[PDB]
């Protein structure tokens, strides 16, 4: 008996086999969940990647900046899962910030249009997905988004940290709306994970100083974490998302669960 | 397949059929856990109460202010579960504050000896149980304690709120030690639950004004909670404790999980 | 000897005699500060309003969404205060959210373009003013912005609360940059103040339910505040801003000071 | 015109010329305050030390664990300042934890009697001083205590961190009582200061590993602080205490002001 047996769950945010969402989707399928996937722009690529998941799942296009995609999404999901069925879960694993808003590009030099695009994709879209999908969610359902703890400023992450602060605030409002449907809304604040993009950044893609700073941050994270932190292993994060999708945290909403090795609880 | 199948878990804090720990123990057994119980002082009473749990579990005496009890505890547990077996989980569901430290007795009028007894039982003892039991815990294990959010001052709870603030700090240090064993340490911050003691307090046992204030607090809690809060139902709390005892929050330690309906995330 | 004697301070955000910034400016002048004022759009109106301040102060136009205004601002300030002089202080008292983002208009129904405009004005602009002005600030200087505590969701404030969460994050990054100049950056989180706009909202301008909710929030604030809260009196807020502008909080930066009667420290 | 002209202020916690309280007292006198001092045990020593303050101030004995001292304190203060006069300010700069509760002595090995003594002196006593002194405080008055940010666990500080967590909670309750008198209660959370005791600890007095860890913590603090941190300079801390004693933070109570260089706002 899987943790998520018979649950119907939408998972956004797969782009590579290193996406946190890929691991969320693998774990959820291992636990009995029936999935619908959403992808942005490179659908042929995403399908090829998702062919490696343990079970079949339909893939729907979703650009969160596209109002038409959002307006049609619930109907497209219902067609995929069948009329008369609703979702039990939704995973938001979507984030973006233009290069001007991250790395060695100075914090003050990021144009607002770039920051605004990043906030749109990384924070506002959590509300936009909830608006689209709550009408097709069952009572007892769960919406989960991916977060990085923004309560203190960090090198390099710059405006992405600001976007996460906005996301945390959005989640608290989404919980008010979601509760009317009997649905929970929460974020998982993960420690650093070496996705393709993060590996590129560590390698200097957004400047050497920024890569060096991120490498220092990752090392400090494992050091501070009482149980350690493995940046090469997304499974503990995926498991935590599944815990929130399950029936086992039924009184938690508007909240943040930290899948970070405990690092945020320790100064040094 | 239960959430906790094959896990060996110690549960402290049962005194009545309304104890949060009673519900923790029922749920954990429903999920396949094999339990050892600890009780304070009234062992015949506790045995009679625990006869109503769905499965048998040995009951061991533990007064957390008694150093001899603590020194012998791991040996007594090992005898109960069998040599060569260790615990996978520990639940601390223990709290006390003398009457002078709660209710209408003025905050300033509580003698230190009373406050100190309350802190001993309610906060220090989380460290004392961990010291006793970590040497008989398996890697991957989990220690969970019960908390009430003390980040803002409240009427009536007075020095018990101070004790919880101390407990939260103790948990963060216990996580450092526990991590050396591969063990997690976390608290569950519950909303208000109408245990026998709380019902007595609402009824005026610690003064009418204090009862009135607590009644107001409970009503506000349900109002603020986006998914509501039922003070007569401990099951959602028990489920959350079981989530932390399980393998599904493997990267969370030194932390607090709020089983409170989301109330702490909303101002009004 | 005034608290701010000989300090040169820029104050943004005056639009009426009820603006928090008007009071900040009056108090700072009472304490010896020499001011430069900035205003948005209705300059003749603002001049007429500012004629009531106890001392003369030049008024410069600043629309924070106008890159040309921002690019020219330091030069315009220097002309006002004289070549070879720099500022010791900067006050950001600027906020806006379109009606779709506040009140009874549903949270989900706010278009991104509206939210983005609000975030631009209310959060990003704190970075944009700092970028413009740090090059003309003295060591030991202070940048202060106005904040409302967004750590928990509230009725009616909706996307403005999200904007404040973003502002708090921006302040922490601005402090990193400002520190290179020997300059502090902090926010003052005020309790509710009955400005003209807030009075209109309480009166129903953004819907009756929203007005009712805000009225309830204000009453709860005075109740929770251990020293009370007078929503008709901005002076305690203005004084707190002046404290941060002064030499008396020299080791505080990236931070938030709560001028709220202590309400955020109390649950009830 | 000094910041504190004509204010009558009690300052506890002087033991050496490196005590944070010595600097608080020097700065307050420089700003016009008339002081009463309290000292523990070594009164001849304290008098000799306080002879170096810029102005005369009476010294009263106060052991905060001595109920008789506390019961007589207001009468002794009134005799010192004259009948019909009251205090405007109170500074609590008192802390202690036995060696078993700090350094390399393992966290689990601290006996409760030692922890309890530390909590008594370091946390409960903030309530005990307020109880004693509020009846002789003027409206508009201010009580300030010294704090170190305990929200995350640290090496070496061990049970002292737990005591600070308790102190923060006590302050929030003291603010409720103090508000009835028109009096504010707040803490100043300082960065690390090289007092004699701290220098001894860095030098290995509580074990080499603990000294090494504290040295690492101090270095990280200056690094994280956007405006830097000088552990050899208590003046910025003293100034912040004086800001809270003044009339310039009139709407802040139950709160914590961080005089730490901004370090707590930055991850790295
Ligand atoms: N290190 C990490 O990899 C990391 C990642 N996350 C979050 O996890 C989520 C998933 O990102 P990932 O798995 O890291 O990486 P990713 O690059 O695999 O996935 C990002 C996804 O966003 C999608 N996306 C972008 N623009 C759009 C759009 N217009 N419409 C729809 N989708 C779009 C894109 O297609 C892709 O699938 C994001 O919310 C991240 O912020 C959270 C925490 C950590 C983190 O960044 C961090 C930082 C600081 N301290 C600790 C941790
Ligand atoms: N309302 C509640 O019932 C409530 C209870 N808790 C915690 O849950 C835990 C269990 O208490 P309960 O189930 O409420 O009540 P309870 O009275 O059933 O159990 C308390 C237990 O402590 C035991 N105990 C006392 N002294 C000793 C000792 N010397 N040695 C060993 N054991 C001892 C006692 O035998 C009993 O089993 C405690 O940590 C509580 O603080 C947490 C949160 C809420 C809460 O108080 C609250 C307050 C404010 N906002 C929200 C929630
Ligand atoms: N209640 C309040 O009045 C209140 C106000 N503040 C902040 O105080 C600051 C000043 O606003 P106020 O004094 O309330 O009101 P206001 O309407 O007098 O001033 C707002 C100013 O923004 C200016 N502005 C708008 N758009 C632009 C632009 N394009 N370029 C430049 N300037 C522009 C405008 O000209 C005006 O001067 C803002 O940051 C508010 O968010 C902070 C806290 C409280 C608050 O909203 C609150 C909410 C919840 N809990 C507690 C408190
Ligand atoms: N580093 C520091 O020196 C430091 C000190 N403080 C606080 O500042 C306050 C003053 O201590 P200090 O100036 O450091 O040192 P201190 O040793 O000069 O003074 C401590 C005082 O306590 C007095 N005391 C002890 N027992 C009693 C008693 N029975 N009755 C009455 N008085 C008694 C004693 O006489 C002495 O005057 C305490 O509350 C400290 O916790 C706050 C923050 C920092 C800090 O410890 C820290 C830790 C971690 N991150 C950052 C900062
Ligand atoms: Na570690
Ligand atoms: Na469910
Ligand atoms: Na509710
Ligand atoms: Na496990
Ligand atoms: Na009040
Ligand atoms: Na200065
Ligand atoms: Na620094
Ligand atoms: Na005053």
Short mmCIF file of C-alpha atoms in Angstrom, two decimals, chain A residues 71-172:
data_model
loop_
_atom_site.label_atom_id
_atom_site.label_comp_id
_atom_site.label_asym_id
_atom_site.label_seq_id
_atom_site.Cartn_x
_atom_site.Cartn_y
_atom_site.Cartn_z
CA UNK A 71 -7.77 29.29 -18.67
CA UNK A 72 -7.86 25.98 -20.48
CA UNK A 73 -5.86 23.95 -18.00
CA UNK A 74 -8.62 22.51 -15.79
CA UNK A 75 -10.52 21.30 -18.89
CA UNK A 76 -7.38 19.74 -20.31
CA UNK A 77 -6.64 18.00 -16.99
CA UNK A 78 -10.22 16.72 -16.72
CA UNK A 79 -10.00 15.28 -20.21
CA UNK A 80 -6.78 13.53 -19.14
CA UNK A 81 -8.10 12.05 -15.91
CA UNK A 82 -11.67 11.57 -17.10
CA UNK A 83 -14.88 13.41 -16.54
CA UNK A 84 -16.16 13.09 -13.01
CA UNK A 85 -12.66 12.70 -11.59
CA UNK A 86 -10.78 15.43 -9.76
CA UNK A 87 -7.27 15.98 -8.57
CA UNK A 88 -6.07 15.22 -5.07
CA UNK A 89 -2.76 17.01 -5.45
CA UNK A 90 -0.90 19.70 -7.27
CA UNK A 91 2.87 20.28 -7.31
CA UNK A 92 4.28 23.62 -8.31
CA UNK A 93 7.99 23.15 -9.09
CA UNK A 94 8.51 26.17 -11.26
CA UNK A 95 11.05 28.99 -10.92
CA UNK A 96 12.96 31.35 -13.12
CA UNK A 97 14.94 34.53 -12.82
CA UNK A 98 16.68 36.22 -15.72
CA UNK A 99 20.46 36.37 -15.55
CA UNK A 100 20.42 40.06 -14.70
CA UNK A 101 18.68 39.17 -11.47
CA UNK A 102 21.21 36.56 -10.31
CA UNK A 103 24.97 35.96 -10.00
CA UNK A 104 27.58 38.57 -10.33
CA UNK A 105 25.29 41.01 -12.21
CA UNK A 106 24.96 43.71 -9.50
CA UNK A 107 21.71 43.62 -7.51
CA UNK A 108 21.01 47.25 -8.39
CA UNK A 109 21.50 46.72 -12.07
CA UNK A 110 18.63 44.31 -12.65
CA UNK A 111 15.97 46.02 -14.70
CA UNK A 112 12.44 45.80 -13.35
CA UNK A 113 11.15 44.05 -16.43
CA UNK A 114 13.53 41.19 -15.67
CA UNK A 115 12.68 41.06 -11.97
CA UNK A 116 9.00 41.21 -12.81
CA UNK A 117 9.26 38.27 -15.19
CA UNK A 118 11.01 36.29 -12.47
CA UNK A 119 8.38 37.16 -9.87
CA UNK A 120 5.65 36.28 -12.34
CA UNK A 121 7.01 32.85 -12.99
CA UNK A 122 8.38 32.13 -9.54
CA UNK A 123 5.71 33.59 -7.21
CA UNK A 124 2.53 34.84 -8.85
CA UNK A 125 2.18 31.61 -10.76
CA UNK A 126 1.60 29.70 -7.55
CA UNK A 127 -1.62 31.70 -7.19
CA UNK A 128 -2.42 31.37 -10.92
CA UNK A 129 -2.09 27.45 -10.74
CA UNK A 130 -4.23 27.33 -7.63
CA UNK A 131 -6.91 29.49 -9.26
CA UNK A 132 -6.94 27.19 -12.28
CA UNK A 133 -6.96 23.96 -10.35
CA UNK A 134 -8.88 24.36 -7.10
CA UNK A 135 -12.20 24.01 -8.98
CA UNK A 136 -11.06 20.51 -10.00
CA UNK A 137 -9.62 19.45 -6.62
CA UNK A 138 -11.15 17.11 -4.09
CA UNK A 139 -11.61 17.89 -0.41
CA UNK A 140 -8.59 16.68 1.50
CA UNK A 141 -6.38 17.70 -1.40
CA UNK A 142 -2.96 19.29 -1.24
CA UNK A 143 -1.11 21.96 -3.18
CA UNK A 144 2.68 21.99 -2.70
CA UNK A 145 5.26 24.45 -4.01
CA UNK A 146 9.04 24.46 -3.96
CA UNK A 147 10.75 27.14 -1.91
CA UNK A 148 14.42 28.04 -0.79
CA UNK A 149 14.51 29.86 2.65
CA UNK A 150 14.72 33.58 1.84
CA UNK A 151 14.51 34.93 5.45
CA UNK A 152 18.14 36.06 5.29
CA UNK A 153 19.96 37.52 2.29
CA UNK A 154 22.52 35.36 0.40
CA UNK A 155 25.14 36.04 -2.21
CA UNK A 156 24.33 35.37 -5.86
CA UNK A 157 20.68 34.39 -5.48
CA UNK A 158 19.83 38.07 -5.42
CA UNK A 159 16.37 38.73 -6.89
CA UNK A 160 15.47 35.04 -6.85
CA UNK A 161 15.57 35.32 -3.04
CA UNK A 162 13.17 38.24 -3.26
CA UNK A 163 10.92 36.13 -5.49
CA UNK A 164 10.90 33.38 -2.86
CA UNK A 165 9.98 35.85 -0.16
CA UNK A 166 7.03 36.84 -2.36
CA UNK A 167 6.16 33.16 -2.92
CA UNK A 168 6.03 32.48 0.80
CA UNK A 169 3.59 35.34 1.20
CA UNK A 170 1.50 34.15 -1.76
CA UNK A 171 1.28 30.68 -0.23
CA UNK A 172 -0.29 32.10 2.93
#
